[PDB]
């Protein structure tokens, strides 16, 4: 039999079979009330759409059950009782939530076995590492997660409620300042597309701003669904600059470069070196051209000159969490780590705490 891997994001579900190079199912994490994912969107003007996962944490369990059902039966076309299933969770996911995921997998879906891994840990594993610090940033939440020998270090984890959806909202705001108007849910989707296709991170923000002066060499045109053509200029890099300057959207938080530094500085002196040399980026919001080079530059400025800095950001990093799960679930020596149905029946949902770490 084959293991399943499901990475349930605030924005997108990534699901597929262990051993595959990529998730075969990638679809919106929405339920419309009934309808799930891409079917829900197409039927939006009759159903009422909702995101069951908020900032990486499951908040609507009845809708989450719908997502998992749709994942097994409609996307993957499997019987869940025939497949061990690896799920993912956010750093700092509450104990009760892990228990509820476990209870549902065994009691509702009758999986023969399951496991739940921290998303950032899987990102690290996908790069062939067990020690490093991961910047994982998706649609709903961003974390800095230092990890030593597979263990996320809870006291040093940084959570930031600034991610992809927030960047989309900010881009709507600043494009609206240039004379355009993006306000509705439908219009937000257009702006998400603009963001994904045209935004980038400047190496030197102030210099890039000054460049948007000397010229229009940074300007791109974008055709709207109604055929109107708009022009985007310094918004291309002002949008993700917010990750380095959260004050752009009024947040008091330090930017992702400083929170990376702060996270490392909370860790044991003798592992700091290993964290600096193994900075892995994962998630859709790390996909901006220029982001790795900018992180390299900002971390170098904060760190001792004695420190070797390495940013690891592979082309496939949008899916590194899923890919890490695919690798882990396919390991021969991982088979002893699954929670089996037998162990569950004997121990109940709390089994997840002693098996999944």
């Amino acid at each position: 039999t084959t293991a399943l891997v499901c990475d349930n994001g605030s924005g997108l579900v990534k699901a597929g079979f262990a051993g595959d190079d990529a998730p075969r199912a990638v679809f919106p994490s929405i339920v419309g009330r009934s309808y799930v994912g891409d079917e829900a969107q197409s039927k939006r003007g009759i159903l009422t759409l909702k995101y069951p996962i908020e900032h990486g944490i499951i908040t609507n369990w009845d809708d989450m059950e719908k997502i998992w059902h749709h994942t097994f039966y409609n996307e993957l076309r499997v019987a869940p009782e025939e497949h061990p299933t690896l799920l993912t969770e956010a750093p700092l996911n509450p104990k009760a939530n892990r228990e509820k995921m476990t209870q549902i997998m065994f009691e509702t879906f009758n999986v023969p076995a399951m496991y739940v891994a921290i998303q950032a840990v899987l990102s690290l594993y996908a790069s062939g590492r067990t020690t490093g610090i991961v910047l994982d940033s998706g649609d709903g939440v961003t974390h800095n997660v230092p990890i030593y020998e597979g263990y996320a270090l809870p006291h040093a984890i940084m959570r930031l409620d600034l991610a992809g959806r927030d960047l989309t909202d900010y881009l709507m705001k600043i494009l609206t300042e240039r004379g355009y108007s993006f306000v509705t849910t439908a219009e937000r989707e257009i702006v998400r597309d603009i963001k994904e296709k045209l935004c980038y991170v400047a190496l030197d923000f102030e210099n890039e701003m000054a460049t948007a002066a000397s010229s229009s060499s940074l300007e791109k045109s974008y055709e709207l669904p109604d055929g109107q053509v708009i022009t985007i200029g310094n918004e291309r890099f002002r949008c993700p600059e917010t990750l380095f300057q959260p004050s752009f959207i009024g947040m008091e938080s330090a930017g992702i470069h400083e929170t990376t530094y702060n996270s490392i500085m909370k860790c044991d002196i003798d592992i700091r070196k290993d964290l600096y040399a193994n900075n892995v980026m994962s998630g859709g919001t790390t996909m901006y051209p220029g982001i790795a080079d900018r992180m390299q530059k900002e971390i170098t400025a904060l760190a001792p000159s004695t420190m070797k800095i390495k940013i690891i950001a592979p082309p496939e990093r949008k899916y590194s969490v899923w890919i890490g799960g695919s690798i882990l679930a396919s390991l021969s020596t991982f088979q002893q780590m699954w929670i089996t149905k037998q162990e569950y029946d004997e121990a109940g949902p709390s089994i997840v705490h002693r098996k999944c770490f």
């Binding site: 030593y148 263990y151 809870p154 390991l331 770490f357």
Partner: peptide, 28 residues
Amino acid sequence: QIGTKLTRRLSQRPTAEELEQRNILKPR
């Protein structure tokens, strides 16, 4: 060799208790 090497790095993984004893693993 991700799978193999990761298997090896995961093979000799320490326990939570011994990372705690070494002041590496701490509660929030």
